[PDB]
Paper text:
The latest LHn/D derivative, SXN101959, which combines the functional BoNT fragment with a GHRH ligand domain [qGHRH(1–40)], presented potent and reversible inhibitory action on the somatotropic axis and such features are well aligned with treating overproduction of growth hormone. SXN101959 differs from LHn/D, and from natural BoNT molecules at the linker region between the two domains. It includes a Factor Xa cleavage site, a GHRH ligand domain (qGHRH) and a GGGGS repeat (totalling an additional 56 residues). The engineered protein was crystallised as an activated di-chain molecule and diffracted up to 3.1 Å resolution. The two molecules of the asymmetric unit are overall similar (rmsd of 1.05 Å over 828 Cα atoms) and present the same disordered regions which correspond to 66 amino acids of the linker peptide (described above), and 17 residues of the belt region. Indeed addition of a large peptide segment at the LC-Hn interface, which is essential for BoNT activity, did not affect the LHn/D scaffold (each molecule superposes to LHn/D with rmsd of 1.08 (821 Cα) and 1.40 Å (828 Cα atoms), respectively). No noticeable difference was seen in the backbone of the active site despite SXN101959 being catalytically active. Clear electron density provided evidence of the zinc ion at the catalytic site, which is coordinated as per the classical HEXXH motif. The targeting peptide is not interacting with the rest of the molecule, which is encouraging from a biological perspective, as it relies on this freedom of movement to activate the GHRH receptor. Indeed the structure of SXN101959 showed that addition of a long peptide ligand in a central position did not cause any significant structural conformational changes, thus demonstrating the robustness of LHn structural framework, and its ability to accommodate novel arrangements of the domain subunits, such as central presentation, within TSI proteins.
Numbering used by the authors:
A (entry chain B): 509 to 550, 567 to 911
B (entry chain A): 2 to 443
């Protein structure tokens, strides 16, 4: 149902992804360039300590102004749904709890203090039962058994994307793109693509590259050919340096945002283990019997095994997120870069054809036929690969 | 190995390695300050630091930085705390000399003194009267501080700023001081370190993690944190420090969530090293090499034409400083007798100070858990008594064998080590991105 949300969540500044500004990286590939006839680039041993004093010298006083103090302000960010940060706050335990119980609804867990959100329906059943007039380890191990099997879940999507498998419980855990409630993390991830995990992040797009030009005169013999060979060197440089710019954007803007899901899911999985640990300890106090002091050593090992079993689930999420970060570079960024490079190539080629058409008579023993065949340089292109 | 001398704050001024220094760069302390020389041209000054006009160690009303912040006026005021601080860095400098790369790092700092001159000085002169090279030594003669002698230090190691967790403090330079650090001449480094206070990280993103134990929240080993700061001194001293003008800027925009971050400078990516250096493209990284080369060539041609000096009474010491800076930049000699830049030895030098000397390279060498990529999440910081050998040794750091800490179960783990005490969130200041809605919702 509906639930009037009237309160904020204060997320810390350095628990958010660093996303660099697009203009702040490097503008060199977009700048225009003029091509010329010579464009070309590419013990300690055991010593003695000496007296450090020296004779005094007259220094004038270096008048330093000093730094001005700057007070930084907080940010408010209004959002249209219960996003990841709301779903995370629901999973937390209150300050000095008593009798906690898990719940499948997020809005109940936010409102009530004792109630805590869970993204696993089967876990909500088996946890809230407790020791139903029976043995302790019968219930307690069934909770951890159900907890383990659910965090190792992997769904195999096919047909579309290089991503082999996706982890389905991220959807109800963090509500990525309002996936929970609708209940279609698997469908929405396939339809929209890998960029779905970036919540409301502007779609990647690259502006047009810099234009090559030449001198108006270029009146010397040998000179026009001497600069056209250097033009083809700068074309290869432009492909090379455009890929480095693409990687500069990926490393500073994209990879950081994908790792945010790694951090959020570890927090999510940690709050679930804290809820199970608390419930076991509460039910341990409520339970009584002859075999109680005997199992003490065994139950503490079951609590410590949760920390190991989260890492097993995290290694799947790391593997999943690493794919998503890498496949973003291949299918979202790279095609737009190659398309813009192909526009740059066609624009540079039309310039080179018309450069030869302007200068027919100079420096030729009919080498126009030989020079027109050098367009085979544009035939082959510089590829890009990963690992 | 350059030897690390032992000291106490109780030890008196001996007019050799213990002195009193006048530091105009520190606004907080107007008077001269007691200094110690732990090794040749590397001095420790157990004092708090501040470059601001109207400075204060007290906690401000609102946050002054984007980083995680912690203030304490009590830290490094009494002589007992200065004695702890002095032994701390002395202990870290011993731990640097445990591996080979640290011996090499210290050696660069010792020999690489700043050039006596700048762009303002003409080709035929050494300028011995500048604050980028010189620091004034002073006696307390008859109720007043008189200027007695000078020193030519490479690194001055001060205490922390008002914000103890500020790691960018070493990058702070004031333009006129900075210009030497860009143009090959170099300048004396002024570091602001807090050994006991540690930044913390986790290996949640990195799949290289403990399958036995799990994902750990760990601390930076204070030797790596110090060596990180010393790599800025290395860049400042050899005149290949990238300017603070060259930087990455954070994007904050409504639509998607992101950090209201600081400006990450190009120097900070270089000194960290690894994959994050590729954030700066090769077209920019190549330009810095060609610029550095040109400055090194012009500095060699300066040494060929020198005859006068400033002041005039230092003409006898021209051959002395020719030997010092020739060994620093590692020039060769051509068929005339003049100095010349060997390009193969330059490329070897420049690549050593940028690619080899870096944080990611140290963390692998010293056998310690560390941040894998520069933008790893900052967790709650910690405090640790490094002087106690039961907590922290010279050979292995926090990871000690006798207390049940192998390399997987690292002593750097905060959860599994009680000696790594946490700072309370009441004292730790933070900015916040506030997530609100003020709506009905379904
Ligand atoms: Zn730094």
């Amino acid at each position: 149902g509906s639930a009037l949300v009237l309160q904020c969540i204060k997320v810390k500044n350095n628990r958010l992804p660093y996303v660099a500004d697009k203009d702040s990286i490097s503008q060199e590939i977009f700048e225009n360039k003029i091509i010329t006839d010579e464009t070309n680039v590419q013990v300690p041993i055991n010593p003695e300590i000496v007296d450090p004093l020296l004779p005094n010298v007259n220094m004038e006083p270096l008048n330093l102004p000093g730094e001005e103090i700057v007070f930084y302000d907080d940010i408010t960010k209004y959002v249209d749904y219960l996003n990841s940060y709301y779903y995370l706050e629901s999973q937390k335990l209150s300050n000095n709890v008593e009798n906690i119980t898990l719940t499948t609804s997020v809005e109940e867990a936010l409102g009530y203090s004792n109630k805590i959100y869970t993204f696993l329906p089967s876990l909500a059943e088996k946890v809230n039962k407790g020791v139903q007039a029976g043995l302790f380890l019968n219930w307690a191990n069934e909770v951890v058994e159900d907890f383990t099997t659910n965090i190792m879940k992997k769904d195999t999507l096919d047909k579309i994307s290089d991503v082999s498998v996706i982890i389905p419980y991220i959807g109800p855990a963090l509500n990525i793109g309002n996936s929970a409630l609708r209940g279609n993390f698997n469908q929405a991830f396939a339809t929209a693509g890998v960029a779905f995990l970036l919540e409301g992040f502007p779609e990647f797009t690259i502006p047009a590259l810099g234009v090559f030009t030449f001198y108006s005169s270029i009146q010397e013999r040998e000179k026009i050919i001497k600069t056209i060979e250097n033009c083809l060197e700068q074309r290869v440089k432009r492909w090379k340096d455009s890929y480095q710019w693409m990687v500069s954007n990926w490393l500073s803007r994209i990879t950081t945002q994908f790792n945010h899901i790694n951090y959020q899911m570890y927090d999510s999985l940690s709050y679930q283990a804290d809820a199970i640990k608390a419930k076991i300890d509460l039910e341990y106090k409520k339970y009584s019997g002859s075999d109680k002091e005997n199992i003490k050593s065994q139950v503490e090992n079951l609590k410590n095994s949760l920390d190991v079993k989260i890492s097993e689930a995290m290694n799947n999420i790391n593997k999943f997120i690493r794919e998503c970060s890498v496949t973003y570079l291949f299918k979202n960024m790279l095609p737009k870069v190659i398309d813009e490079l192909n526009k740059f190539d066609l624009r540079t080629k039309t310039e080179l054809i018309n450069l030869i058409d302007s200068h027919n008579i100079i420096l030729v023993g009919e080498v126009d036929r030989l020079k027109a065949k050098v367009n085979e340089s544009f035939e082959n292109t510089m590829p890009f690969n990963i690992f | 190995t350059w030897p690390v001398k032992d000291f106490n704050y109780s030890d008196p001024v001996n007019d050799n390695d213990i002195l009193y220094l006048r530091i105009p760069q520190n606004k907080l302390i107007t008077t001269p300050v007691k200094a110690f020389m732990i090794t040749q041209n590397i001095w420790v000054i157990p004092e708090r630091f501040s470059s601001d006009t109207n400075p204060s160690l007290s906690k401000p009303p609102r946050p002054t930085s984007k980083y995680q912040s912690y203030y304490d006026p009590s830290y490094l005021s009494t002589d007992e705390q200065k004695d702890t601080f002095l032994k701390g860095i002395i202990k870290l400098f011993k731990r640097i000399n445990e591996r080979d790369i640290g011996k090499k790092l210290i050696n660069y700092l010792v020999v690489g003194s700043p050039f006596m001159g700048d762009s303002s000085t003409p080709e035929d002169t050494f300028d011995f009267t500048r604050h980028t090279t010189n620091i004034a030594v002073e006696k307390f003669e008859n109720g007043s501080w008189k200027v007695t002698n000078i020193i030519t230090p490479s690194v001055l190691i001060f205490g922390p700023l008002p914000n103890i967790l500020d790691y960018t403090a070493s990058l702070t330079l004031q333009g006129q001081q900075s210009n030497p650090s860009f143009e090959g001449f170099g300048t004396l480094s002024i570091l602001k370190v807090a050994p006991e206070f540690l930044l913390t990280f986790s290996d949640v993103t990195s799949n290289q993690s403990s399958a036995v134990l799990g994902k750990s929240i760990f601390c930076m080993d204070p030797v790596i944190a110090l060596m990180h700061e010393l790599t800025h001194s290395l860049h400042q001293l050899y005149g290949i420090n990238i300017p603070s003008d060259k930087r990455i800027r954070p994007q904050v925009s409504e639509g998607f969530f992101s950090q209201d971050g600081p400006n990450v400078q190009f120097e900070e990516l270089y000194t960290f090293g690894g994959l994050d250096v590729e954030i700066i493209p090769q077209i920019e990284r190549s330009q810095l090499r060609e610029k550095a080369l040109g400055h090194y060539k012009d500095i060699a041609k300066r040494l060929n034409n020198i005859n006068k000096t400033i002041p005039s009474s230092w003409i006898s010491n021209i051959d002395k400083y020719k030997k010092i800076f020739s060994e620093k930049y590692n020039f060769d000699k051509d068929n005339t007798g003049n100095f010349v830049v060997n390009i193969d030895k330059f490329n070897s030098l420049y690549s050593d100070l940028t690619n080899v000397m870096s944080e990611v390279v140290y963390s692998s060498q010293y056998n310690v858990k560390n941040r894998t990529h520069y933008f790893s999440r900052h967790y709650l910081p910690v405090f640790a008594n490094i002087l106690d050998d039961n907590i922290y040794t010279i050979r292995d750091g926090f990871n000690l064998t006798n207390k049940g800490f192998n390399i997987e179960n690292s002593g750097q783990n905060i959860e599994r080590n009680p000696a790594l005490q946490k700072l309370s969130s009441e004292s730790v200041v933070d900015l916040f991105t506030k997530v609100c809605v003020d709506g009905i919702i379904t």
